[PDB]
Amino acid sequence: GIPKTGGDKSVINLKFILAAIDAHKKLGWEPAGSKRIGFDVADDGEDANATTLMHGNVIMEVDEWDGLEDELLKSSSRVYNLAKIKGASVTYDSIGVGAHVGSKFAELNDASPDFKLIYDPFNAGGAVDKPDDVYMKLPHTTIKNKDHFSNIKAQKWEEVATRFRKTYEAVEHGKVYPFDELISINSETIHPDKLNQLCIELSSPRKDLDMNGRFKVESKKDMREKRKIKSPNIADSVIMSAILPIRK
Numbered sequence: 001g002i003p004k005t006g007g008d009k010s011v012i013n014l015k016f017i018l019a020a021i022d023a024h025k026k027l028g029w030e031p032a033g034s035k036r037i038g039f040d041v042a043d044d045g046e047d048a049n050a051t052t053l054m055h056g057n058v059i060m061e062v063d064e065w066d067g068l069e070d071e072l073l074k075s076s077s078r079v080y081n082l083a084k085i086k087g088a089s090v091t092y093d094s095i096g097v098g099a100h101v102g103s104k105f106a107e108l109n110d111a112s113p114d115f116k117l118i119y120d121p122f123n124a125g126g127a128v129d130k131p132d133d134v135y136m137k138l139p140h141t142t143i144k145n146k147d148h149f150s151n152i153k154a155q156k157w158e159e160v161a162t163r164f165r166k167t168y169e170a171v172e173h174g175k176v177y178p179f180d181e182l183i184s185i186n187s188e189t190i191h192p193d194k195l196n197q198l199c200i201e202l203s204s205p206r207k208d209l210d211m212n213g214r215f216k217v218e219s220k221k222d223m224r225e226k227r228k229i230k231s232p233n234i235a236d237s238v239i240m241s242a243i244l245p246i247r248k
């Protein structure tokens, strides 16, 4: 329903995530579309760097590695080379340590004669895409995107959750959607440990409220302090890998 605070409701219901595992095999489509990498950048020892590779609407690869700011170059190079091998764009956490990532990418693009990496910064607290669009129509007013979402992070998290929910509807209830509106997790290219961790992490952050009454994702800080839960870096990389480019 409406955005609320407290409770224990996941932004992405675990049963949606389970239903999405090999959902493209169950429903009958193969990965087709743009290739995108989400790159979450570690900020403390409590964090790890995470990458998620999606092809179209299918999560294809997940990876995790340690590294702080003083090896950022190496990390950046890693993500660059992955992007060159997979032929993918990159959306990366651009706050904190990530504020120093763009430079690195630029350098590599400047040295590359053939490959130009398309990379976009993602500021979780930034403004929502299409703020004046209608999120929900009412008898005489409309809830706008700017009325429902606290920030762009909430917007992207709910967009991915909507993908998972439609996928659950299609798998468990036989409901019909255009396949591009769904999402799938490719088990054959993801280690079972990583698949389990992905399922746990994506369903870890809870629904919350900002002080304007807009939907907000439970903060990492609140997860760590109020609930003593590790940072779901892989889930953040997944959310960033699902982001579709805007302005053209």
Ligand SMILES: [Mg+2]
Pocket (backbone or CB within 6 Å): 040, 041, 042, 043, 093, 095, 096, 097, 098
């Ligand atoms: Mg970060």
